Amino acid sequence: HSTQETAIGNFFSRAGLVSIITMPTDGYANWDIDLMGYAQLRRKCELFTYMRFDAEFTFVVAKPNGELVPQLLQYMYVPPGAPKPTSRDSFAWQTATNPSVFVKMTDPPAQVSVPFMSPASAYQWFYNMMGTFSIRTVGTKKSPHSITLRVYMRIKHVRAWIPRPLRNQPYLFKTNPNYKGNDIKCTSTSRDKITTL
Amino acid sequence: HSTQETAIGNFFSRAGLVSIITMPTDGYANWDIDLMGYAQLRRKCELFTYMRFDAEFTFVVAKPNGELVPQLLQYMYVPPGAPKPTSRDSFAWQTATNPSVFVKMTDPPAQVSVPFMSPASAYQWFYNMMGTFSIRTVGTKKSPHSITLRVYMRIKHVRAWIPRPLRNQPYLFKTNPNYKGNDIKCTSTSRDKITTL
Amino acid sequence: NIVIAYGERFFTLDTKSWAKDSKGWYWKFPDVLTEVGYRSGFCVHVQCNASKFHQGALLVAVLPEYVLGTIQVGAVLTHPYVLDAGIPLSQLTVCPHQWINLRTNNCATIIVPYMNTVPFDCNFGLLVIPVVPLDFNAGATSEIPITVTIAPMCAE
Amino acid sequence: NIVIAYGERFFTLDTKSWAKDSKGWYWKFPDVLTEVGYRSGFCVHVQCNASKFHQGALLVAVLPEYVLGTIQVGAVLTHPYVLDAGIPLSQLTVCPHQWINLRTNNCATIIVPYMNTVPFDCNFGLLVIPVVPLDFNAGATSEIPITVTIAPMCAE
Amino acid sequence: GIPTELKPGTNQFLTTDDGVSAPILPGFHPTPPIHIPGEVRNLLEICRVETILEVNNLKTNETTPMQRLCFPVSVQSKTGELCAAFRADPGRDGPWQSTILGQLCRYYTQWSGSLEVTFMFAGSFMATGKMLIAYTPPGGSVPADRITAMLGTHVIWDFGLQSSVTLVVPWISNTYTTGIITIWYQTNYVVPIGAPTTAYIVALAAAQDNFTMKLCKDT
Amino acid sequence: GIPTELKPGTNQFLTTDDGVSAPILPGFHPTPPIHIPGEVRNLLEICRVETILEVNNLKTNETTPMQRLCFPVSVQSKTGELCAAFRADPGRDGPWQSTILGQLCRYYTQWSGSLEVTFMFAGSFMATGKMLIAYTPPGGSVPADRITAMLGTHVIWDFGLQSSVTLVVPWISNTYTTGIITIWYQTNYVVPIGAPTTAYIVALAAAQDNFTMKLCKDT
Amino acid sequence: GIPTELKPGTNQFLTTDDGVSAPILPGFHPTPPIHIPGEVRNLLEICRV
C-alpha cells in the first residue's frame, strides 16, 4: 500500500470537540480560541515545534435536551488586538471591524474559516493569540430558553518543523510543561525478571 | 434482450432494512454491523465464498407513531479496533478518531458510505468485523421523546469468487452453518408415483 | 480428461474400502500430508480398481473452505444428502468435479491451484461420495479399493 | 564524522568534571558567549580526554526551544530521565545528536544552522547526558574533563 | 449566487437510487485486490453447469433422501412401457427444485430460453439395452404408448455403446407451457450371469447460452 | 431558474468532510512563509531514527529510572547462558513503549514491515568477548540453550573488534506474532588488571523503509 | 432535475462576504463618470505627505 495515511495533512484531520459552552437563563459568553484545551490535540501538537495552518470552526447549537426553538443568535469573532465585549449591550457588538454571523437554531450550523493570524511565519508552543469568540442572543429582552453549544475545529494545510520527543508525563498547568517532582512514572511497563519473555 | 439484469452488481442492489433500533424513555444504543441479520441477504451472500464491496447506510428516524419532533441526534461510527461507548456521557463520544454526523429529525436522512475495511483482499464467511455504530441524543438532560429508527444498507461495487451450493436448510445459529439432525427435509416436492405427470 | 479448476514426488494415501452401505469420505487439505515424508499447488489423483461385473458411480469434487456442522485416513460422512454442512449433494457440480462411473473409466484427477485472500498463509477439501451404490452378485469381491494419490506443485 | 542539522575564532568554555554520580549539564545558546571576548550559525565541538581503562558513554544533542519546568558554566540537571521538561531521554535521538563512547572515539561536533520563525531576532540548547555512568578501579583518575569549543559562522 | 429552483421530488428517500454519498473515512486507503481465480461476473455462469435433478421424488423416499437422485431400471419390466415422466419447468415445484437453475430463477419472474438434459447410466459393463427419450411440444398431450411418442421429437439411447445422452429442449417461456419428457422402454434389459439385475440412471440438467431472465423478485 | 433536486444527505454535519467554507477575513493577507529547516512531510521520517529502548524494566528500577536504558554484563556469568530476552512488538506494552516507533503506532491500528535493532557496547577498550544475538521466527518457541538458538537466525557479535551490531527483523504484522530476540553468552567476559569488571549495553531500535501503517485511532 | 446537496453553512449571514445580489432597479442607467483630478487609489498616498 501507499504512505498516504501517515501524511501530515491527514494526521490533523477529523475535527473533534474543542469547547463546550453553557448559557443558562448573563446572556453572553467569551471563549478564547486555544488548541490545548483537552488532553487530546496537545500531545499531538507538541510532537513538533513550528506549525503553520488555518482554522475551520462549526457551531452546533441546541437546547440542553435535544429539541430546537426558533431563536436567532450571533457569533462575533474578535480580531487579535481588539477590545472584548464586557456587557450584553456594549458598543463592541456593533463594531464593523469585528466580523459576525447571524444563524438560527433551526439552521444547519455555521462554517467559519479563520486564517493564519500570526505576525511570525509559524506558531510557537515553546518560548500567538489567534483570537477570541463572543456568542450572544439578539434583541433587547431576555430570551426564555437555555442555550448550549459545542465548537468543533478542523486544521487544514498543516506544515510542521523541528520534531520533538513526545510527552509521557501528565500535565499540571496549561502555560508551561511542568511535572510533579514527588514521583517520576516509568514510560514502559515493568516485569519480574529480564529473562522472562 | 441483453444480460444486464443478471449481473453481479444489480443482484445486490435495492437496499433493504438490515436493523431496527428502539430507544424508549438508557439513552444510547450499540448496533454491530452485520449482513446476516435476517433470512434475506444471508442465503444470497452464501452463494459465493469471497466478496469485496463497500457499504452505504441510511438512518430513517422518526417517532413510534409517524410524527417528527425538532430533536438533534448523533450517529457515531466506531472503527474496527476502537473501544465502544459504555455510558451516555463516556469519553468515547468526544474521540476525534471516531467520525460522527449531526442531523435532526426534521432533516432528510443521512447518507454514510463505509469503505472496504478488511485487512485481507476480500471478505470471508466460511473459515472481518466491518464496524459498529453508536446512536445517542445530544445534551446533558434526558430528552422526553421516544426515538426509533431503521437502518437501510446498500452494497456497491460487488465482486464475487468461488460459487457455492445454496443453503436449503433453515438456520439455527448465526456463527456456524448448523442444521437439525432429527429430520432432513427434502429440497424438492414429492408425488405419489414417478409416472404421474 | 484433465480438468483444471476455474481455468487457470507422488504421495499415496491409504486405500478406502467401498462397501455396500458406504456413505462417503472427505479429506482436509493440506492436513493430509503433515506427518508423512506456505503457498503451493496440488495435483490429486483418485482411482479405483473394479471388475467388469460391478456397477456404481462416485462423485469426486473439491470444495474450498468446507466447514462442518454439529448434528490421513479421513472421516466418514454421516448425512451425505446435506454433506454435514447444509448444502445439497445435487448442486455440488458447481465446483470442479469429476464422475467416476464404473462402466467406462476408472481414473479421476483434478488440478487445483492456490486460492486464498492472502497470498502467503486448511484451504480446501475433497469429497468422494457414492451417489449410485455398489451392487454385485454373490461370490464376487465385496470391497472395492479407492486409492488417492496427491502430487504437490510449485511450493513456496 | 561531521553531522549537519537537518541536512542544510574558536571560543573555549570551562571544563566540566565527569564524576561517578554526575547527572548532566546543559548550556543555553547564544547566552554562553555574551560576556567573553542578530543572525548567525554555530559550530560546536565537544571532546573529552580519558584513558583506555575508563568506560562510559555520553549523549550530546542540541535541542531547539528547550524550556524548563518547576519541580558560561552551565547548570546541572536534577532529573535526567525527564530532562526537567517532561520529554524522555530515550527519544532524544530525534534531534541532531552524537554519541561519545569512551571505547572508540573521543570527539563530537555538530553543525547547527540558523532556525527561527523570524529571520532577524535563546534559540537552542546543548544537553550532555551521561547515559552510561563512568566506571574505573581504585588508583585511577576520578574525574574526566569535558571541554566545549564553540565556533560561530556567518554572523549578521 | 446563481438562481436555482426546487423541482417536485426533493427530500425523499428512494431505495434504488445511484447516489454518490460522502465517505466516512476520506484519508483511508483500502487493501489492493490481488488475483483470485474463479471470478463470477454474471449469474449465468452458475446456471450453465450440469447439476443433478431429483426425478424419483416419491413419498417413501422422504426418510432416506439419498435414493431421490437415481431412478431404477430392471429386468422384470416389459417392453413398450413407461419408466418415468417429469415436467420441464424450473420455476414451479417438482423435480427442478433440486438444481441450481431452478433455485436462481426463483429470484426472478420471467425467463425464456433453451435447456438441455443429460442422462448417465451407472450399470454393469456386460449389460446392454435400449431406451427412448421422448419430448412432447408444449400444448400437446402425454403419449399413451411407445408408438405415438416416436412420431414426435425423440432420441434412441442405447447404453451398450454410449453412456450419456443429451436431449435439448428447444424453447420454454413463462409470462400451460409444459415440456414433459417421458422415458420409454424400447427393448428389455438383458444381463448375463453374474451381472446385477437392477441399474440406476442419474439425470442432469443445465441451461444453454440463450437463457435470459429479468424482473428480479425477492422470495 | 435551473431545475434542482435535494438528494438524501443534506443539512447534516460530517466531521471528516473536505468542505471549502467562506473566510472570515477576505481582505486579509497572511504572513508569507520563509525557509525553516527540518520540514517533516510524513510521519515515517520520525519513525526511521534509532532511539533508545528500555530492555531492563525490572521492579527495582522504578525508583531510579536512569538504570532502565542499559543492561549489564559481568565476569561471574558462565558461558552458554542467557542474558536478556524481549518481545518485538511496538504496539503492546513492554520494552517498546520507550521508543518513538512504539509511540506513533499507538495512533494507528494495523502496521506491517521490517525493523532493525542496533546494540552498542560501553565497556573498556582492553576488554574482549563474544555475544550471540539470536532471533526466533514467529510461531516458534524460545530456545533453551545456546545450541538450538544457533540453528536459527543469529549473528555472532564480538566487541573486541567492532562496537555496534545491527540485527534486522524480516517481517512483523498485526491484524501470536512475536519476534523474541535473545542475548546469549558465547564466550565469557575477560578483562585485564585495572579494567572494570562490569560493562553496559545500550539497545537502539528503528524501522526500515517498508514499514507502513493505516487505520488511524485516537488513544 | 439535477441532484444537489446542502453542505453545512447555508442560511447564514456573514458580514464580510462577496455576494452578488439582485439589483433593485434593473432598467436604471447610472450617470457616467467623468475625469475628476486627485484620485486616491490607496491609503498610502495620504500617508506619504
Numbering used by the authors:
A (entry chain A), B (entry chain A): 73 to 97, 104 to 205, 228 to 297
C (entry chain B), D (entry chain B): 30 to 37, 62 to 90, 102 to 135, 155 to 204, 210 to 244
E (entry chain C), F (entry chain C): 1 to 175, 189 to 232
G (entry chain C): 1 to 49
Q: What's in the article?
A:
Coxsackievirus A16 (CVA16), a member of the Enterovirus genus within the Picornaviridae family, is one of the major causative agents of hand, foot and mouth disease (HFMD) prevalent in infants and young children.
From the same CVA16–8C4 dataset, we deduced three conformational states, namely C1, C2, and C3, at the resolution of 3.05, 2.91, and 3.36 Å and population distribution 15.5%, 27.0%, and 57.5%, respectively. For CVA16–8C4 C3, the radius of viral capsid is 170.5 Å, slightly larger than that of C1 and C2 (162.2 and 163.0 Å, respectively), and the two-fold axis channel in its capsid is open, while that in C1 and C2 capsid is closed. Moreover, the VP1 hydrophobic pocket is empty and collapsed in C3 capsid, but filled with the pocket factor in C1 and C2 capsids. Additionally, the viral RNA density is present in C1 but absent in C2 and C3. Collectively, these data suggested that the viral particles in C1, C2, and C3 adopt the native/compact mature CVA16 virion, the compact empty particle, and the expanded empty particle configuration, respectively. It appears that 8C4 Fab binds only to the native mature virion (C1) and compact empty particle (C2), rather than the expanded empty particle (C3). Such a large movement toward the 8C4 Fab may create clashes between the CVA16 capsid and the 8C4 heavy chain, thus prevent 8C4 binding.
